Amino acid sequence: MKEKIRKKILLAPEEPGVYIFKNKGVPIYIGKAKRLSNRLRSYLNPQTEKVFRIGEEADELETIVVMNEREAFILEANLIKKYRPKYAVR
Numbered sequence: 001m002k003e004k005i006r007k008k009i010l011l012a013p014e015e016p017g018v019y020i021f022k023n024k025g026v027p028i029y030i031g032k033a034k035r036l037s038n039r040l041r042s043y044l045n046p047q048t049e050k051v052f053r054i055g056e057e058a059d060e061l062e063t064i065v066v067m068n069e070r071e072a073f074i075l076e077a078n079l080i081k082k083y084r085p086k087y088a089v090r
């Protein structure tokens with residue numbers, strides 16, 4: 001995983017949000033979190049091959065802090081529909 005992505009993961013706040021792993025400007029995975037910190041840190045110790053892939057293929061990680069879990073739910077759904085990320089279940 002790119003050092004800058006590890007750094008961003010370790011700096012992520014204990015706040016609700018949506019996260020987007022990207023490669024060459026294209027989202028490859030979009031997820032939500034009740035706490036960005038907790039969820040993103042799970043990528044550092046990959047529990048599945050897909051999680052390993054997402055973290056190795058990405059060249060960028062974007063995070064969006066949201067108002068609350070309801071916003072996270074709908075923002076995530078909308079972004080997945082918009083971008084159809086390669087690692088999103090279809």
Ligand SMILES: [Mn+2]
Nearest residue numbers: 030031032076
């Ligand atoms: Mn999700």
Ligand SMILES: [Mn+2]
Nearest residue numbers: 022060061062
């Ligand atoms: Mn960007």
Ligand SMILES: [Mn+2]
Nearest residue numbers: 068069070071
């Ligand atoms: Mn709420």
